[model samples]
Target: GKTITGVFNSFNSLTWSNAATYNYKGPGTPTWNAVLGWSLDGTSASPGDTFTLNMPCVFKFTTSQTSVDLTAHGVKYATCQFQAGEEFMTFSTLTCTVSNTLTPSIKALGTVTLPLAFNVGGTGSSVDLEDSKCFTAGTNTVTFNDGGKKISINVDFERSNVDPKGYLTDSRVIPSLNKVSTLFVAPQCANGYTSGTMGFANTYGDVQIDCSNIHVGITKGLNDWNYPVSSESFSYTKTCSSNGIFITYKNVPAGYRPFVDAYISATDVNSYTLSYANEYTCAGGYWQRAPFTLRWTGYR
Candidate 1:
């Protein structure tokens, strides 16, 4: 590790002196909280799906005794936000409440939210966007029925890989790692020798092109969360294309997962087969959910 020092430019004698005292650096990774839920790829959605945010590296409790589980309940109220890899940063204000299902003895289970989707950044507030009725307590509460009392519950979720630095000011170039899988196509025969067969009896089925890109917008707050709040909004052009329409950007040889457009002045190729694989993975760490506050007295 490298030694670190600080130079105070604006502070006077008193503040400057304190700055020096606070200069010691620690040995481990910087701490951050874990976001409450898994990043939804929009695969499935419904109402009343409660998710919870937890303190990172912190161990909570959960039990199998009762059907009720408040394991994620101890996670002090925070905003459960979303980064769609596009669009604005959505957040929970001090006004929202996150809850966990637990038995009479307060046994912990997992958390859920209402409706399949929630709003993030339009109009600076949840005001302009409509709320999902799927999560309404009266209509959306999915009860946990563990037969024990106060069992400890725990929660965890994979964070979004959307990067903030790459957007806005171009903090860094998108790594070559940030690329679509390889796909190559060509008319050739070499390694195995003999020329390959051009005429083929083929089969056909559904073809889906699943892809996502990280879109960055200027953050609003002096802190990373400022923009996720009301001051600024998340921005984006549109969602990714699902059906396979284009493939000119991916770089690969012709033998790999070759791209084909059978319609436009192309061969009468009636069918094509495609497959995908990830060569690498990046763990961007857990995303923290902002807290939502409630106005009533007891638990929500």
Candidate 2:
């Protein structure tokens, strides 16, 4: 089987590098692309002869591109048509056939490129993209026969494919939590302080990201955190709008504490706990929850 040869440089960059996670961009974003190079080793291809390429299931086909011309040595020998995969993320396939007959018996070499759709996000419950492992955990070799030559190509999506949870292992709260805060007017703790520099970072390697990219959500738990409740004296600037992912208080003068005077002062509510988590709803990874506590004793 040495009549035809093939090579794939579509995912070479992503497969070769150590980019923690493959792109699973959100909806409306641009998609990835792949190319398949094929050569008909000086062989004779008559009208109606065909060539085919089976796309990996991990990628979705976004365009309605149906056909393209295959030219070699100044001769247009064949035309390639693309077809979407079957249900449950099947392999999208391509079929090329000799369409033009300038003379007869045409020998050719060409490439076929298709836009890779990786816009699907979230958990596995609703999958627009194949979030599960298709082949193994590493590079996968796809082999097929064309003419008399045996062709093989390697595609690696292991980073975003295997164990989606492993993508973002843990969320580290930078500088550690103050743990306990003392307050005199309920915002003050027993003796310690409630104000500290607050920001977020994660254990996921390969990139430096913050609330801007993947918005981290903070919600009040047990009691009433009433945080981000910036009053007349305290101003709150939530970068992520009302969703409140960051705690920027203009009244802090230096540091912004989510706990303001209006922060859980119900008289009966002596303690308030707050929890923050990675809201990485994208298919990039799963998130973990982190919590911090605040209590008041001597309220004046």
Candidate 3:
């Protein structure tokens, strides 16, 4: 029986009981048969050659989202090769080297860019790891695991600014046209009376209003050329379903009413009719078309 102890660079330590049996233990699993030979015998020129051993092994690695500690297994060798898969796709065909002190580092074959995506729990969205700079608020540590190896990586996942699904449930305002209608004269009038259309043009034309939101406003100025004496006003009304505005004339005289007693046409969201008729109880002008100005101001 022989007692032998040797510190193999690859295994950290190895021992032999009988000349035919050997055993070793170290940081990581050593490849079987990697230890090619052990010789207790040596040449006479190099006397006192107690023991000799040859050991060589390969280290291959894969990545994981789980945490790992390289030094835990006493992984002495610094270089590790990454396997091909989604976990290591960002560094495909890449190699990582850990110093004996266990500080790991990698150099890209050329210029390497790592793209990352993280699925946030509860939210049906993937965080853009590339765009968002994620950071732990306190002592939270994120980890990556490949096989049994673990790496702790500090990462910050950015919440996306994207609108959620079906976010457009509320009504949206359709674009309104800044419009002008052709002038139409009253059909029947007396010699003393005249009739023509007088309406307003929006000075703040070509403005978009979002109905789904709130308290949006729009405005137009009254361009009444014919009636200087009548000071009429106007306002807008909106229908949620129609997605249109009703530019109605306000401040009508007590005796007067909407010209033609007409209602806003639901079909035409862009156009409005301007008209004026005299009071039925009035004298000569009672039966004639009266000149009126329909002006509107901005109203919430």
Candidate 4:
């Protein structure tokens, strides 16, 4: 068998296969005695994800003026198509941030913009194939199969659950390990009144705190947010479960930005509210745009 390579110029017109004009030889229709064949199979493609075509590949279809519905096998969020131009859905975030509460679940949110072509291909240099596609990430499933001839192809996409509370149970997204350095201050309301006990910096302006940065005492009554004796800086190993700095407090007021600061790095600084609790225990505030400016010039 002679092997030939050519860019998928368009959809279907007429291209040479070996030494003659190539036409669509579908599986359902028997035309070239199995010589010319076509099929659309999906191994694993999902939504909000990117599909990477790593090699110079060709997808064959009938050019004999016929239409085949791939949705039957591809399924929703399956087919090799990008929402954007030449971009495939991906589960990676460019940037994002979120707020946290002592007993809450916070997650950084964003979408991976997937283009039309997850990968690109070309001959000589004019057919250089693209390697990556970005798209929004969420719950999705894909299934495809074709049996016209022997073909080997796989759909590849990286996924991260990105759920703060679910991170421990789900291995989709792992917690950051590099010591998310921060100053967990036990905030005090009204000078020294100590109304709500020693609350952790999580809530602000009637907003709910995300549980990502929450710290609790094993001996404490779990729900009791009493002031913790462990005030010194401690460290946790990074994993899909328990990680990062833990600050303990008694009672955290609703809607109060305390003086708690996070020396995130050598220069990156951030501060959160000491007060500000939301009505719903399931909601949290947007912390990505918090006024805490990040400084990177302090270190060499």
Index of the highest-TM-score prediction: 2
lDDT of each: 0.20, 0.34, 0.22, 0.20
Count of backbone collisions in candidate 1: 62
| TM-score of each candidate structure, all chains considered together | 0.16, 0.38, 0.16, 0.16
- The alpha-carbon deviation from the true structure for residue 19 of candidate 1, after best TM-score superposition, in angstroms, is 43
lDDT of 1 by residue, 200-253 (tens): 111223333333422222122211211122222221122323433222122222
Off by over 4 Å in 1: 1-204, 210-243, 249-273, 276-300
* Root-mean-square deviation of candidate 1: 23.6
lDDT of model number 2:
0.34
lDDT of 2 by residue, 124-240 (tens): 111211432234334556543443344556644333322221212111111112111111111211122223223332232322222223322221211111112121234344433
Report the error of model 1 at residue 13, Å: 38
Candidate with best lDDT? 2
lDDT of 3 by residue, 10-55 (tens): 2111221222121211111111111111111111112111221111
Task: Quote model 3's TM-score.
Answer: 0.16
